[PDB]
Symmetry: D2
């Protein structure tokens, strides 16, 4: 009953299931997990792949023999489980050397060290088999108005991203970059807060075909925006390379709950938008199990994310495959929305007398749009109570 399979492209993170529960008012409630154990339990649950930070796989300040031993043990775990790695990311936020930032720091040697650590993790990501890179700007911001010059910081972020694009062009890899936006937490105001700010940063670079977005449901719900509107703008731009699925209960701190929890209707319209657009990337869950749970609660939340995605996929397919719903879609003129406005020309629009001169504004205004009947049909197909 709603059993996940590796053909559904369900991927998880190592920091998701390996989170020890350290919130800033409490200590850790769970022990540290082996990545081999995490890969084997995610293979028993039915996932497709795992993602990793560099500090999640290899600990900080270790030797090259311990680095290649960790890479060999992780490669033996992936070869015995059959799982892939579709995405990797870097850690530029945990260490106190990155307390002002990574690529946009006030120290040039800290900026060069973050670039060198990023280039080493890109080499490890291509060596492990990833095809998407994610650069989350965690510490890139300020707590006051005079702590960062924002135009110079966008110049240094453009210089660092063009250096990474020049490095992958010179090595000839097939990896592509993704930018993960967030409005705040841990900084007061994180640079590029939204998907649109990330896309406007992407269209100013030198090689803009290698950069996309990695949006998050929770990170766009802390700004109070609409996540199907952001995903549909990113798909209209053709730049959605990766996605992150979690839950959020409104404008607050980053909770990172399981998928389906929080805004269930927005998750339903997100799953309906991805199934109607045909997004063929990985389905990544960047979530956190709560610190009141044990490891059985961790794997129960990891099963519940995939179960909620399969239930919402079945409800969205049953919503879109219905003749009464298609009659309500024809009654709400959404097929006339798909028609072009003026395909006859600008001179034909200026010479058409029925657009301004004989247009009846009262007869066009006394026409119901019937959106509430379609929304009640969507609510009945979501809850399963159809007559």
């Amino acid at each position: 009953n709603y059993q996940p399979t590796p053909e559904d492209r369900f991927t998880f993170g190592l920091w998701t299931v390996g989170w020890q529960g350290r919130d800033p008012f409490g200590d850790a409630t769970r022990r540290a997990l082996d990545p081999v154990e995490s890969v084997r339990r995610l293979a028993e649950l039915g996932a497709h792949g795992v993602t990793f930070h560099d500090d999640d796989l290899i600990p900080f300040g270790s030797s090259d023999s311990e680095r290649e031993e960790h890479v060999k043990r992780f490669r033996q775990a992936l070869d015995d489980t059959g799982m892939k790695v579709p995405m990797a990311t870097t850690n530029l936020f945990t260490h106190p050397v990155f307390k002002d930032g990574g690529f946009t720091a006030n120290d040039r040697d800290v900026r060069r060290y973050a670039l060198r650590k990023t280039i080493r993790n890109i080499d490890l990501a291509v060596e492990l088999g990833a095809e998407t890179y994610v650069a989350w700007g965690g510490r890139e911001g300020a707590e006051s108005g005079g702590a960062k010059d924002v135009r110079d910081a966008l110049d240094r972020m453009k210089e660092a991203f063009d250096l990474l694009g020049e490095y992958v062009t010179s090595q000839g890899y097939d990896i592509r970059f993704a930018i993960e936006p967030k409005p705040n937490e841990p900084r007061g105001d994180i640079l590029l807060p939204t998907v649109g700010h990330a896309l406007a940063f992407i269209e100013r670079l030198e090689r803009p075909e290698l950069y996309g977005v990695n949006p998050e449901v929770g990170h766009e719900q802390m700004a109070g925006l609409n996540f199907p509107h952001g995903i549909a703008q990113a798909l209209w731009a053709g730049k959605l390379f990766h996605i992150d699925l979690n839950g959020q209960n409104g404008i607050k701190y980053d909770q990172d709950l399981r998928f389906g929890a929080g805004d269930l209707r927005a998750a339903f319209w997100l799953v309906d938008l991805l199934e109607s657009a045909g997004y063929s990337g990985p389905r990544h869950f960047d979530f956190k199990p709560p610190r009141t749970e044990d490891f059985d609660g961790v794997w129960a939340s990891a099963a519940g994310c995939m179960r909620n995605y399969l239930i919402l996929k079945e409800r969205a397919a049953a919503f879109r495959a219905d003749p009464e719903v298609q009659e309500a879609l024809r009654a709400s003129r959404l097929d006339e929305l798909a028609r072009p406005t003026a395909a006859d020309g600008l001179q034909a629009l200026l010479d058409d007398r029925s657009a301004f001169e004989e247009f009846d504004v009262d007869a066009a205004a006394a026409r119901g749009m019937a959106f509430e009947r379609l929304d009640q049909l969507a609510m009945d197909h979501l809850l399963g109570a159809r007559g």
Copy 2:
């Protein structure tokens, strides 16, 4: 004492001072104002120009003789006061024919009527002397997830904006377009909610040099974002053609208070950013006086906006012209932020041994950034208590 002058480019709107106080739980508390009286009182207060909707100047469904009589009376008022018109906008939100939207509606004749009304107001705006056009997407959105298809709606908005750009290219005018973002109110989720979403829409058009943004302090503070960060990203893109100044007390409804009220520190850093960048456009106040006030309170709020801008301009100039502040700026390494990261090359960065191999992360992490001393100097220069 802080007397405004027309060289300071202070502009207002007709709907700002002519607001009758109709909120959705109450009736109107003031009578309708004459635009001639509004232009003469704003000339006595010391403004530079006025802006207008088409429905603010000429009422709906009137004749051409009453239209040219209103244009002749407004032109006689501008010729006797000496004020200009730097900006005009259209009204696609008040009438019930635009209850689904203007350029992105589900009715093709409503879309063509909104385009024809926009072209007629562009002809009136060039005839009156404006050089910036503002298209605010007021009703462009939905209250449910299935009421709009967002990719087709962005296709129709791209088609309508390319038709307006083709019209001003064919007539050969010197006017430029501006897009005013808003997250919500009156719709549940308004398309292009932020400045970054507007810039990402601007970089997908066919002639992108004629389109910019018209951001608002309140409209970016209902999303919980940072308005100097948005204005600095719009100035880094080179697309800030117009601005709107008001106040807002957090994530709530659109209050549209006077300038200085609300986030005083964010208004101070906004005035400091505009004075350091040298923005030479109009200083427009899109504000609303409250409905508890009379007309003396309306002109007191209109004087208080310009007085708050001149006081914040003096405090920002006294903040930037100070040797102890410049010593704190050198101590916070913001001159090293202005230096480039790797101007020696990618191969020089990969061969530089001091970036990764002999980089001391503990000695680079045990260095204070001293942002709080600079923020206390900014607070002392804001409040005037300097020792």
Copy 3:
């Protein structure tokens, strides 16, 4: 299929279905409705009763003959439909004489006029058969910090509510009062913003057994709080006399959507809390149909509110009547939450050695709470996918 009946106590408002669609950026999209027509269509839909403002039933400044003609026509409509009136409220927000407030105004004659209008509407409410009175503080607040003295305003609100309690004690009626909280809109900061602020105001009055709360789902979701937590605190205090059900999509303006839309999981836990506590009052829907809809969309939204309540009542009863859910409730120690902490005494708690001295904090901390398995069971019972 989920047909409503008058035994389910479903009540509506006259201003709900009679809303003409006047938002503050647009005009009215619908004509004015007859209250006789609204009562007859709500009787055909299956409601139990209607509520009214005084200005919704009798227009402002009319004669006593037109007042008794409107009362006679409304009484003939109620006698031919069989519907009741369980609740009435007053209008102290639409007229421009109440632009500073009603009971807490800066004018003593305006305060006395609001008290006299409230006493006349209480006499009409007892004459029509209501048993609950609602006093919504619409305009009771300020836009600046120096426009109201808040302690003197709470003194005048206490004086006005004690005068209304003295009036209903002197007339000997059986009506009870309810206070409806709201954080903002139309004022910047409305006095008594939450249910807890209303309860803390209720416990300072002279006759506190005649005052309760009338909370709203949307009005507590504009503050970002938890509405089952507020309803459970109001039921723990024993003061929940009335309720208002609508929808809201987060911290924004007051949308007043239909029930079920917005936070569906919070609506599910609200319906589960009311069905487990046994709240026997009216089920009132203070909602607004959108201005894109016609009258068929208005009655479709009015049917969809009752259909969503009956579907959530069936899902909450199927959630609570389940042995696997009861086993998860026993595993999550919520039966041990219902046990008292120290029923043996304070000296027995201080002399009990197993509370502090031999208490094993590691063995008590290494115990999973299993909340995620219970929340997945609640999500499966909400969506109907149970194996």
Copy 4:
């Protein structure tokens, strides 16, 4: 220049200046501070006293000899500095045994252990000389709707607070209790989120004269409410026993910035309300220095909190002592707000013909309130630009 003195009652916390900078995306950036060193540096800065958690002073699981050695060293530091202890609090949130909660937990032995730890810290607080106790409900809440029964949890919180009141009544101490509200972080929905919810909990207890509130500026600004409105309701109830002063930049995570930063106008009206009401308690700063700062930045922020309070005290006294401001206060009818509404009686109000019959609503509605001129006078007295 604005030098603080111990007669101004400026108090700090040990966890404020001893915060190591551990946010949930990063590690610690500073070493652990000695409390003797913190008391001596706060005495050199000019504070009046220090507050403490029990885990801040004595570490967890230590012996009684190390406990009395820490108490003897802290007592020698207080005797050599001359500083007091006005307030103490307990730690029921850091350890993983309190991951579900303290007083409202699902485990009875965890509830009894939290009560015994609270009684031991009350004995240490009376032994050190404190007169106010603060019980912050950090972990008292849930992440889902079925994880806590809220009425049973309020019953157990009432039982635990009545047990603490019975303990201080039986020992005969002069200490009083304070409840610190917070909406969320670290839980999803913390029980008693606001000051009004805490006051409504206080008025249900058995001995309600020993319980008050300890509100925070940031904790009431994460709910989007008005903190002078909450402090004025707590002073109208007569229950403000303690206060916490910090800063917050809107509805987000708990930043805990320095005082004056964030909402400067709301901090100005808060300082004006405390100086006009005559609050004679301690002025406590529950703030966090940022992790980019060193120890000189920590003591610079600790000096800047007291400097911002003294500057706002001088500006509020200069605002209230002004004849033009008093003329605007008489013009805005705030002396008529202080007059009672109906001191002649209910029968005199019902027989007064000038309240309803000869009341001119148009002449009372065509009267300006002149709030914007008073708010401009308050802005000019805040910024110091007075003519």
